[PDB]
Design a protein around this ligand. Sequence first.
Ligand SMILES: O=c1ccn([C@@H]2O[C@H](COP(=O)(O)OP(=O)(O)O)[C@@H](O)[C@H]2O)c(=O)[nH]1
Ligand SMILES: [Mn+2]
Length: 282
Amino acid sequence: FMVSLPRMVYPQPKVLTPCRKDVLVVTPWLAPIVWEGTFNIDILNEQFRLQNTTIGLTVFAIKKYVAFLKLFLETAEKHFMVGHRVHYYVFTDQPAAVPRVTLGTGRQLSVLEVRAYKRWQDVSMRRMEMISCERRFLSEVDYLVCVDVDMEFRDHVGVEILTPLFGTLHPGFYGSSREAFTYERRPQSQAYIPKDEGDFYYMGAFFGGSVQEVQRLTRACHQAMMVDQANGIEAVWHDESHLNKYLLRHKPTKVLSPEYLWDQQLLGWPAVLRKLRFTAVP
Ligand SMILES: O=c1ccn([C@@H]2O[C@H](COP(=O)(O)OP(=O)(O)O)[C@@H](O)[C@H]2O)c(=O)[nH]1
Ligand SMILES: [Mn+2]
């Protein structure tokens, strides 16, 4: 049950004037594509605070990648879901190397010890098995957000992203034709997508949704990866390839623009990006 919003004063949305004319702001299945200028954060914050929303953030820091946690967490404290309840879940092979980062009120961090795989490919992929922790998330958070650690927040990432299931447009492919998408192209793989299929190329570094939908996605991807392994094939881009197959066949209910996953070193700062929110660390 949802209580009424309070009286709020804000500019009237004008039907005969788009918020953005330069970009697609809704998919053909009527999912919003989240860009700066498309949302009033005050309205959204009200809607989500009235539900006492808790957001879980999962992040893997294995072997040398523990070095990225301090900046990741400090910047998340400045920019990620500020004002809302947040539970970070840090999955690591080195619990003692997790930095002691000072957290704001209503925010907590759990360190979860996992095994370290030799191959970075396996480390990256095996994130699906670990996320699929099932009993824990259901009791503790409403939404799960799954991100890479070699990153920093530079601007607001908030409740505008929350929805049953979301993916993020990969910054290298948002302007590309589908034939250029680096989907898995071998029919022998469960991740296979033909040249005439595909909506978007989503990045493995930022996806999420409700706990139920995220655990459906991660279970499905893990099972598909196990089939591939049994068949002696490894998808070209690992769990990202599987994530893309899943989101082709199960359309996300929001899509995040590349504001939400950017690499300024490789791609600069195009005019179409009004904000750079969450960016790669060299
Ligand atoms: O040795 C490793 C390799 C990978 N990862 C995790 O898997 C994610 C994806 O790998 P990576 O960031 O290297 O992929 P890329 O962004 O370079 O494509 C990393 O962000 C980490 O969260 C890790 O913790 N230790
Ligand atoms: Mn990364």
